[PDB]
Amino acid sequence: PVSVDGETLTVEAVRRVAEERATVDVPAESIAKAQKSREIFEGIAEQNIPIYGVTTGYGEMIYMQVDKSKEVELQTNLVRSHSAGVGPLFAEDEARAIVAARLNTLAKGHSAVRPIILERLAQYLNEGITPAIPEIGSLGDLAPLSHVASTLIGEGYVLRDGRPVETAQVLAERGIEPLELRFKEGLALINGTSGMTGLGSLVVGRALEQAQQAEIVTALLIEAVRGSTSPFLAEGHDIARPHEGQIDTAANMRALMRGSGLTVEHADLRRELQKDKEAGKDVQRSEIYLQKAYSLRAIPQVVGAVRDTLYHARHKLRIELNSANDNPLFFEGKEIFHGANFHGQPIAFAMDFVTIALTQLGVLAERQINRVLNRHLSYGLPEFLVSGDPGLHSGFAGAQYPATALVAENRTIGPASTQSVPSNGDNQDVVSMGLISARNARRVLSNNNKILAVEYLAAAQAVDISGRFDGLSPAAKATYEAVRRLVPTLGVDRYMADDIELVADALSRGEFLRAIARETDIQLR
Amino acid sequence: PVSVDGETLTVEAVRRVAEERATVDVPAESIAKAQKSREIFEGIAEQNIPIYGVTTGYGEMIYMQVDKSKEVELQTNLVRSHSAGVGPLFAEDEARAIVAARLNTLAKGHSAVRPIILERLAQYLNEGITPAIPEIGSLGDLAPLSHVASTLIGEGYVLRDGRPVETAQVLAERGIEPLELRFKEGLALINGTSGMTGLGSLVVGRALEQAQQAEIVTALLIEAVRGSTSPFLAEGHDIARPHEGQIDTAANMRALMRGSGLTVEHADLRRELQKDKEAGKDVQRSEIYLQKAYSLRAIPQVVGAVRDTLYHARHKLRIELNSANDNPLFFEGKEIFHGANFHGQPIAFAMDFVTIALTQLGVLAERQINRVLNRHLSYGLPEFLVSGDPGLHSGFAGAQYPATALVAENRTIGPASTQSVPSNGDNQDVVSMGLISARNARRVLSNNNKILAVEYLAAAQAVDISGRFDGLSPAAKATYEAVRRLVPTLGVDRYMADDIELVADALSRGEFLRAIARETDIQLR
Amino acid sequence: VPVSVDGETLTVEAVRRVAEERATVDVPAESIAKAQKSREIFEGIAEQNIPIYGVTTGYGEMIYMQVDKSKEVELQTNLVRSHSAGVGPLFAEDEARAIVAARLNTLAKGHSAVRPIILERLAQYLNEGITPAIPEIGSLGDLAPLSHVASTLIGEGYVLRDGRPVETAQVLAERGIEPLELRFKEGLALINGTSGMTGLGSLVVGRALEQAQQAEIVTALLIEAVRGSTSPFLAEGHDIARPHEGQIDTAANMRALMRGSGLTVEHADLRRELQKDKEAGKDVQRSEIYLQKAYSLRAIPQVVGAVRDTLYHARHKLRIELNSANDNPLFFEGKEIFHGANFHGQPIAFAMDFVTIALTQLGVLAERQINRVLNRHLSYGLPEFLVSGDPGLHSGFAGAQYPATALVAENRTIGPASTQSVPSNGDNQDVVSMGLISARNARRVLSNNNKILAVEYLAAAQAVDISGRFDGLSPAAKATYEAVRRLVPTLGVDRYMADDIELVADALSRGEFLRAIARETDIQLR
Ligand SMILES: *N[C@H](c1ccc(OC)cc1)C(F)(F)C(=O)O
Ligand SMILES: *N[C@H](c1ccc(OC)cc1)C(F)(F)C(=O)O
Ligand SMILES: *N[C@H](c1ccc(OC)cc1)C(F)(F)C(=O)O
Description:
By secondary structure, chain A is mainly alpha-helical.
């Protein structure tokens, strides 16, 4: 059971709830400190004092003073008039991630909403009622959250088997009476960064597994090509260049290739090469490379940088998930706080950063593909991994194209956290566009699975084309089995698409890294 | 019947074939000049002389010499090994546009393919057999076209009711015997810019109607706000600044507002304002604006620039549609041409340009929305077009958000025609990425319908909130009726999403501009 | 010599002549007469205190402020002063001249209602070398830049000399010129246009075309050094198969450039050589001969053609803008004052964003051709990285490739500007073009490409002597080579390259290589 207390929620906890449909539970302490705030706040609204969103207009119309007899109407008109989202609907797991992040915010107890709101949100999550949330509309997350707030009052639509069906039917069809929004209940449900923070959570969490899976195949590839282990020696990171991420990647690469009979140690290389030099010449030509190319050597540096960015992103997400990103806010014997904790800038940046990081992750992946496919760079393999007669057969030559195309496509994605456009009169003169940032990262993450899919296939192909299967380390054989369990070796050439999408979906499921855990005890960082 | 002769095909012709399922016909002259080339070429391949793609490997493996006894195998392995496309599948109309562009290329008669290939392509089009083409893979269009070439040989998949179903079943299920690829038939089917040129055609064609529809609502808006006609007077464009597009927009704006009882002439404004000035003061404050803001005045300039870009794009598309974008090429008593007319740079640029143009089109649209929604800029209308008690009701305040978000999202889309990444060894060291460019433009075009949808609704709303319906010109009333026929006036506020998507889909169908044609005889440029 | 600025026939080339080579400018008597007459009629209407934007009303959002004609000079003068708020680097002499030239031509069209004296002053400044100190930043597309120019017209602001800004007043006294006094609508007319982006973009587009030519020139030399196929440039493959204007031109320049080459090979020879290399026995055999070459040496017409097309479009747009009444409000005899927005630089803003993209790709192509010759696996028989002595010990051009590769990456970080409108001035300027930013972006890629091309010219020339293929070069290729070798010596032992590269880059920025061909061959390049 995932505890949603607005204090200890983690990115992984969110994923379990969103992807694995884990049960959520609001702690009595949270549900209790929520009723209290609600009790005091409610006594404050009875005195018809000025409170944004409770007894005033919304946004620029805050100058419009509204009397307390319009309690339910105000909150409702808001939710209905802001449910103006467009574009595609978020997937079931994405929608759940969003609802979880909102509940956790209210569960912190500073939103002064009735306990039943937290309860009802937790019910939808625990009962499988997913709001149909359109992806576009948020300026960083009113509209997306307005469609959520709708389902609670029996309006809008829910996501049933891929399509949106009126909340009304679904609710009555489940024996649930829609709620009625009281003072500041409508505003609290839609006033925050739950859309970007929810989606962001799923993306960063998955981004991390993609780095681990990038490491896994990169490892298989280095063994199949007989690369040097020198680049990953602890002294070069832990001691010489202590970037957290770099150390982690270097550590995973050493563990993944551990016990390989194909990789070479610097000592052996240096000795093999020295044995190849004649002493009567000042400058000789050797066919041996003491170091391999950047793509098979600078892995710790590049992927480590990626990790560092994903670590910083998860950090900001963790802080945000457990924050009172709502407005206005309530405290003990303190004036009602009128700020802007609904501003997603901290996450908008975080995700724009993740987009850049992941894009470089893909760049690196695609070049390794290029490296194994080019006969002048493969270090001994046949052109484009062709088994039979090259020319007549192209092998993986055609498979490289979609991977190269994706690197270019990912590069056309620009940062969104700086594209603020003034609206609502000029009240919202500076916004973050964070949900666009989150969606950008999601896309590059998705495209990276396709690039990686091509790499996983090329590697396995290079393995049984060089006949180096029996030399692969335990983790290397684990990865190889996992690919063949899905796609067989490439004899004559054939329709590639199905094979790529097959390995791609598996990658998005963490099928690899899951195979390493189940067939070793490599504990991957 | 649309004539596909590789010489006279137009962008609109393509749309009719793609969107309206118009019948296609290959002229006897084309089918005849095709058999001839085929006859001579075939006698050239019999002598087992070096011919790229016919008796050699593909791409970098061109050094692999292949004997003529491998005729069918070569072309086949190619189509199968390059069908490595990923991502979503193109829509039925997009796929048809692509097939049409390919057929038209071969119909030019320089590809030396058997007439039956042109015939079979024309059959799929005329019979409703649409190839399931994945959107990603092309480096600018092998993979996308490889999935097409597949269906002709009974492999791959076809697009049936939204999903991909094996070509085999569908073919046998229609009484069609799959073809067998001969010398250079596989290469010719996949070696060109048909993907980007096909999709590009649909996008530019629709882009032009979007400009016309931007003009239509912009016109309704200018009448509803009582704007000045001065900005559109012919002297200011035809004479002072003769940019083709600017003249066209200025001309459409004069025709659209024609006979309006709400707009003001400069003479009247100047007179009204002069009447408002006291003669005893050197500098007075007036509540009258002799000119309106840029968004309601610089329409000819901005939209005209858009038009110019779309005119140049259509031009390049027209030239390309009718070109032999295939390789190698055949001529009369001339060596076999070995060039690179498969390089989509001319279209890659054209579409990157369209992306920028359309993005500015949206920028302008959204600001007009902002203008009508802000009480300090509306020129007399209520805040956010609220009918009842503002504050209590937000009116269109929430509807502005998705439009503002879209301008920002469109801005995150970067040019693709410059993101070339070297592949296939280094044989393809400079590519165009044109299909990504086409897809970029498509997206901004799609987002523009949503922005425009919000504007069309705001305008109609501003009309019956100011009670200026009886003053609207004939075209203005035409547009207004068309909006209300879909969405009623906004009394109390309510769920906006359905209304926006409703006007959005209509916009993508050209429902407006169709209404102007049917309810006037405004001939819009 | 002298160029005629009649607001009707000015060309991008004429603008460059006035700007780059100090060509004398001359406003025709017909234009002066149209100006004098428009001014007299316009004056007669402004003299009646009727409302006219910027003449008897406030500016921008403050148009609601009605101003009496008794304030005629002050109004125009406060405008030019308060709007001279540009920041950043000052444009060079040639850029500032093109700007003033474009402004003079606009007013010379006759619909600005300016006194002929202003037309006279601007032309005086140009013909006498009085260059305004124009800050690059600060226009939204071009008030700030033009206001700094208008300033020097009234003895204020700064003039540029020796690269430093010098108080205008001093300069005018040191030349006998007496400052003007802005009258009705004169301050507004001087700053309310697209002269900033239009003048600058003209220089850029003109140079972009010369850069296209010089790219074709070096590409032709390279193709001959590595003995590529002439087949990709056969007329029938463009003029007939794919008639894209720019594509036809490039294909033609390449054919003219390689005419008379003993190094290039024809498709016929290739296949014959390839068939005699084939042995009747095996079905699939390996050959070391390439019937076709990499895209970088075969898709030149398609790619450079596209760049050309884009440039032809921008030059066309620029030509119309140069001869346009991009000002507001406007006077048309027998008509009410035109109140519009011809000051909006969207059309040019777009054009320049396109040139930036186009030139960026031109640079990508050059970059990969450099890579082509430096890679022993792709150079077709040349030594690694063009090392003449012992490799490893010497790197040759290994390091020269980096500044070029690094520049391709930099050009790709430059995004379109024409779509970046930010509402200002009380939402009155709610949609702008940022065209001058677009034009400076283009200038930047242009500038960067000269560096990429410089490394390519050095590499090609080096590839020639390393392979001892000088005697087989066509007439044009020998000219190109000697032009390079006249600046930089062949690369023997490794040496400092930075100076060798900046030397050829400068030669490229001034059309040196395009001139070598004009003076050494009978070739006419498109
Ligand atoms: N997020 C609030 C908001 C809600 C709805 C709206 O459209 C009318 C504009 C703003 C807020 F006003 F920004 C706030 O809580 O501060
Ligand atoms: N477009 C050709 C091509 C096809 C397939 C391929 O992958 C092996 C690489 C290239 C071409 F070789 F580029 C050509 O026709 O020139
Ligand atoms: N270009 C005019 C302008 C001048 C100065 C200014 O800043 C106050 C704003 C605008 C114009 F108002 F745009 C015009 O001539 O229409």
